[PDB]
């Protein structure tokens, strides 16, 4: 080799020409005398809602998070020392991003004191894909949330129209608790519930 | 002459002959087309909404949109019963919070209603700028979506009387949403004032 | 002396003179400041929150604390109406949820209240640790951004008297959140049992 050009150069110092390679020191290294890159970047993987979309090399929130349904088919638990009954329920599941939503449809029970309690157990009863795990809330505070119920009350074939105060206050071991703090109330043999939903946080 | 060389540049005279060569990190770098390439160039994903690139200061983000979207609707609220029905021009506020759509109804005075009825918004047409109608479609069929209380007074010949109303989101059709009253308390009456009220179901677009 | 030369070394022997030169991918590499050097070196982004990178396991996520973060407020509840106004000691739990804030009401017992009004809650003070005045702004001027019902029984006179009110969340400033009870069913009385209730509204802090 006659001469040389850059990247490679050619020292002459003390009568002895030496051949150079000259590299970027931010760029590469030298490692077991070869030319290697300093800091090979390695990409990062995602949690759950973000994910990889390797078909088109793309992060996204999963569609998942933005909605999943489900049900729950089980009996819908009133509980007072007085007075404690089971009825046959199916009630809708939603998850909304950190929010788990129950939507009832309209129901016949029977009657009910001024206030009381209502237990869903989640421990079996959920639809594919649903753990019981799935319905625990994001925190203690009691009340989590509250929302009204529209009812009518039946006596002696009358129907008289109330209201139920509702509020998620407690989940044991896949038992969700729902508090009726009381509302307008009548002597009465069976309730008529108009439909409702209810919420609460949960990051699941 | 170049009398020497210095790594990566190594001079092996194996087999009678003194040759030159470039040692480079094998998994860093191959040659093709006899010039030094790297071995797997990476490329950088891209992000699909809510999630955006801030390609001003390299940063990824939830697109701030994403926790709050407003917009207005204009049209006619629709009252629907077979015994009865009107319409009633309103403006109602909406905004995008994550994925939920909320609904605020300003105060309002309406005719008379039935014990139980429907209110029909048609988002066809009436949404403000930026709106389209696929933006107000609900992200599942379960019926109810999400019900609440309305507070209202019934005029019956000067009095007037407080109740509630209870409202469910129950169905989206090619632009109609519609809100079912399935009762609350009620008496005979001559007109409805109804107190501002908020009503959200999700909605993922 | 140098026979021969493997690539990335490359010689052209053009017009009686070998010269030796480095052979690198065009796209790759460059020349700069007579170095080998990468053109388009890849900056890794950074993430801003809710969005972090976990460092320890090189993984992006969203920070847990988006779906829950719990806090408290201990102030004075203030009722104000012109012919009525009194302030109640409360302690109310607060969670951000999202791009939401709810704010949760233990049981009550108040004064006596008019058949509409406002409470207004002072957040300027009175924060549990974590909180700032400026996380408890909405994220949208719209009123009322959200309603709820809180049952209550007014007492007048020994009887226990069921009924509602209805809240809607209407006003924040300067740190002092409005929340307008604008009516429901009324009747005569000394004092207010309030049984527990929550509303949110949306915020982006
Ligand atoms: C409309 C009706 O039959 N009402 C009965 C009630 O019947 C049950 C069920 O109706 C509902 C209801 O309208 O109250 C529907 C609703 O989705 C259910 N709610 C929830 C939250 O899932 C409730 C609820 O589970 C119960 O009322 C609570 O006690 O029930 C009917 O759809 C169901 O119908 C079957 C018919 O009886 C049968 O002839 C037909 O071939 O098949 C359908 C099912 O596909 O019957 C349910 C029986 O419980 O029952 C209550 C007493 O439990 C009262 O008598 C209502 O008057
Ligand atoms: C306060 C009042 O005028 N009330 C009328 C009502 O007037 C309409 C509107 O008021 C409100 C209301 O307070 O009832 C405001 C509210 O934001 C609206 N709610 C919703 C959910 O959109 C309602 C609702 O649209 C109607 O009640 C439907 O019945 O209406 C007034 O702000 C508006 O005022 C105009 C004046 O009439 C006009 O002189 C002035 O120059 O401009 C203002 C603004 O454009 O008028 C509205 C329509 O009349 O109207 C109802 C009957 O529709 C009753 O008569 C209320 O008593
Ligand atoms: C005694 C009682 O339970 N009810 C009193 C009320 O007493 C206060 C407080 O109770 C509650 C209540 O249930 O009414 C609890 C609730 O979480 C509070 N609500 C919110 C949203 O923060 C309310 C609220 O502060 C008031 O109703 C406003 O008027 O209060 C009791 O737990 C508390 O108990 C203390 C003992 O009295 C004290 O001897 C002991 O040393 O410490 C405990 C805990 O600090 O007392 C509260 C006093 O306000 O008070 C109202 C009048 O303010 C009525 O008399 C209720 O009947």
């Given at each position: 080799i006659d001469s040389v050009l850059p990247p490679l150069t050619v020292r002459e110092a003390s009568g002895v020409r030496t051949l150079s390679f000259g590299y970027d020191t931010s760029d590469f290294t030298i490692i077991n005398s070869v030319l290697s890159l300093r800091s090979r970047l390695t990409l990062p993987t995602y949690r759950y809602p973000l994910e990889l979309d390797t078909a088109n090399n793309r992060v996204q929130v999963a569609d998942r998070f933005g909605m999943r349904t489900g049900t729950w088919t089980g009996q819908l638990q009133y509980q007072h020392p007085q007075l404690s009954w089971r009825a046959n329920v199916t009630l809708n599941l939603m998850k909304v991003d950190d929010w788990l939503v129950l939507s009832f449809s309209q129901m016949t029970?029977?009657?009910?004191?001024?206030?009381?309690?209502?237990?869903?157990?989640?421990?079996?009863?959920?639809s594919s894909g649903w753990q019981t795990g799935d319905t625990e809330p994001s925190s203690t505070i009691d009340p989590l949330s509250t929302t009204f119920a529209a009812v009518q009350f039946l006596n002696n074939g009358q129907?008289?129209?109330?209201?139920?105060?509702?509020?998620?206050?407690?989940?044991?071991?896949?038992?969700?608790?729902?508090?009726?703090?009381?509302?307008?109330?009548?002597?009465?043999?069976?309730?008529?519930?108009?439909?409702?939903?209810?919420?609460?946080?949960?990051?699941?």
């Open positions: 029970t029977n009657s009910i004191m001024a206030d009381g309690k209502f237990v869903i157990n989640f421990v079996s009863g959920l129907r008289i129209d109330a209201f139920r105060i509702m509020g998620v206050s407690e989940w044991t071991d896949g038992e969700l608790e729902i508090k009726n703090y009381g509302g307008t109330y009548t002597g009465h043999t069976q309730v008529y519930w108009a439909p409702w939903t209810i919420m609460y946080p949960c990051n699941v």
